[PDB]
């Protein structure tokens, strides 16, 4: 249904002119960044799961030219665009980050992965990470210097208002801040952890669930690239919060990631919305990109019935996981809430729990139906007391539970009870979460997103010509500049022939014209041919195909076997 087995690796390479600073290596910061991307892919390729990785490239240029490799751009195009990056612009970090997130969220509304107004599905994920490689240089615009990072809001994407942040559930921002000095640093190659950077990108990185890396040595660079390769995971960032008193600490608030394991991820129960749905609301309330999940450190019992579909999501290592595995209570669980998901309750009813594993090696989130301590006894009694033949009191209690039960859970609950073996338990009716106006707005957004996606995907080719001109001041007319595409057809155009080369080249074109008897009438030799791109210079495998085949008879590389 959704392919989470094809992770997106968006690279936001800083192409501001400050990336022309030279390290002690003799290479620029941009050269270090390109080498870092290449090393990252070399390290990633060791993992067999690396196949199907989508690699994307966005830069600090303007939106028509910011996207170098987006959707439906093959690996060779990515490599060619990476190799030819030039650092010649301003440090428009906020604008470029906005464009990168818009590129990531380009097709979300077309495919309905966000599941707006219908619960948040951790298995509806398109896992991407933005690895932005930059320096700590201050952010710049034409007007002046920006001391802080602020993503622009102008030109909003259709439906961008539905989530109150640009980044999404399944997106993480990582910053590789290059602080490599121009002098060979006297510090030893200490094996300590990588520091968090103090630039303006670090708050945005931490908010997204990622982190910033400060680099000032090639050894540190390798360490960050290895850690980044380890951080390419399919999962969604959950904003875990603490509710109630202790049983201002690192484990009180955390933007941790929960793992989602495919095989096509399979799941049933959504994360509750942050509002109670109604059929008379003209507009859908905006969503936080990371759901505020509240847990109570009470150590309740993790009740489970035999045949229920329960989604299990393994939390990544975090101080909260450290706390849970340090208290050492694998037989108890902390109830988990979403605030304002209920009709009236501010904290709302539980929908799941954190239960440490048997080995105390990991903590897993068990996503249950909404208000599961009330539903699960009833659901057990349905099949244990009367064998899916509901009684009057049971049906009344079930309906009473349904009053506290949000309509967006109706579909998953129907599917669950059907696969237990009681298909006729509830009325087969459409979910009452969304008004007609809301659904019409959603379909209009889907069409607009389709059109905008078509426009953006076709725009990544940079099929435009740079303004090769010098605007002449009075105290219209412009002075042209050399271009890449004006390859001199000196045989076909007499204006491309320099004066110093006029006579010999005249002889050459004369011979090319008259001596073509039983020969070849090509353009200028030594230009159209023998100025091949270096990549195709020694492509003997491709060259041998154009030659007739012969007769059969029976440290890394040096241009052949």
């Amino acid at each position: 249904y959704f392919q989470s087995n094809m992770p997106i690796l968006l690279f936001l390479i800083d192409t501001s002119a400050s990336m022309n600073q030279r390290s002690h290596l003799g290479t620029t910061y941009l050269d270090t960044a390109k080498g870092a991307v290449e090393t990252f892919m070399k390290l990633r390729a060791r993992d067999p799961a690396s196949r199907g990785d989508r690699y994307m490239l966005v830069t600090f240029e303007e939106p028509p030219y910011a996207i170098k490799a987006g959707w439906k751009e093959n690996h060779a195009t990515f490599m060619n665009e990476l190799k030819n990056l030039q650092a010649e612009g301003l440090t428009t970090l906020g604008q470029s980050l906005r464009t990168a997130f818009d590129l990531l969220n380009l097709n979300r509304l077309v495919t309905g992965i966000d599941n707006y107004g219908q619960g948040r599905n951790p298995f509806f994920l398109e896992p991407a990470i933005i690895i932005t490689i930059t320096d700590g240089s201050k952010l710049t615009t034409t007007s002046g210097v920006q001391d802080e990072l602020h993503l622009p809001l102008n030109s909003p994407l259709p439906g961008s208002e539905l989530t109150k942040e640009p980044f999404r559930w399944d997106q993480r921002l990582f910053a590789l801040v290059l602080r490599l000095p121009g002098t060979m640093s006297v510090e030893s190659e200490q094996l300590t952890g990588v520091p968090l950077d103090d630039s303006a990108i670090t708050p945005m990185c931490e908010v997204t669930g990622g982190r910033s890396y400060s680099v000032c040595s090639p050894r540190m660079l390798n360490q960050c690239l290895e850690s980044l390769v380890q951080k390419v995971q399919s999962g969604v960032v959950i904003n875990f919060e603490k509710a109630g008193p202790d049983p201002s600490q690192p484990w009180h608030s955390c933007h941790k990631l929960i793992y989602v394991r495919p095989n096509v991820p399979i799941g049933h129960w959504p994360v509750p919305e942050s509002f109670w749905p109604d059929q008379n609301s003209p507009t859908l309330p905006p969503r936080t990109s990371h759901p505020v999940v509240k847990f109570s450190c009470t150590d309740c019992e993790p009740m489970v019935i035999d045949k229920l579909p329960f989604d299990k999501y393994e939390l990544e290592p975090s101080p909260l996981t450290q706390f849970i595995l340090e208290r050492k209570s694998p037989q108890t669980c902390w109830q988990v809430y979403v605030s304002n998901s209920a009709k009236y309750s501010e904290l709302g009813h539980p929908f799941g729990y954190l239960k440490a594993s048997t080995a105390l090696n990991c903590v897993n989130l068990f996503v249950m139906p909404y208000n599961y301590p009330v539903l699960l006894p009833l659901l057990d009694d349905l099949f244990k007391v009367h064998k899916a033949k509901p009684t009057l009191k049971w049906r009344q209690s079930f309906e009473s539970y349904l009053k506290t039960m949000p309509p967006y859970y109706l579909g998953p609950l129907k599917k669950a009870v059907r696969m237990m073996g009681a298909p006729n338990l509830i009325a087969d009716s459409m979910e009452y979460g969304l008004s007609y106006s809301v659904i019409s707005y959603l379909k209009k957004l889907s069409q607009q997103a389709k059109i905008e996606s078509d426009r953006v995907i076709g725009s990544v080719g940079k099929k435009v010509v740079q303004e090769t001109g010098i605007k002449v001041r009075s105290r219209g007319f412009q002075v042209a500049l050399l271009n890449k595409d004006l390859k001199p057809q000196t045989f076909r155009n007499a204006y491309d022939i320099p004066r110093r080369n006029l006579l010999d080249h005249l002889t050459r074109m004369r011979s090319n014209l008259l001596k073509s008897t039983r020969r070849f009438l090509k353009g200028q030799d030594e230009d159209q041919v023998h100025s091949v791109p270096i990549a195709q210079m020694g492509n003997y495998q491709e060259y041998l195909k154009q030659v007739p085949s012969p007769l059969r008879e029976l440290m890394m590389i040096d241009e052949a076997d």
Binding site: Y1, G112, G411, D428, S429, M430
Partner: peptide, 29 residues
């Protein structure tokens, strides 16, 4: 709402006699 159960679910919802249930499964299909 599975890829191999999208048509089956929307057809069972159509046969159930609900004029609104089909529209919900149509989006998933």
């Amino acid at each position: 709402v599975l890829p191999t159960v999208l048509l089956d679910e929307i057809e069972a919802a159509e046969l159930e006699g609900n004029d609104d249930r089909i529209e919900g499964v149509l989006c998933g299909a």
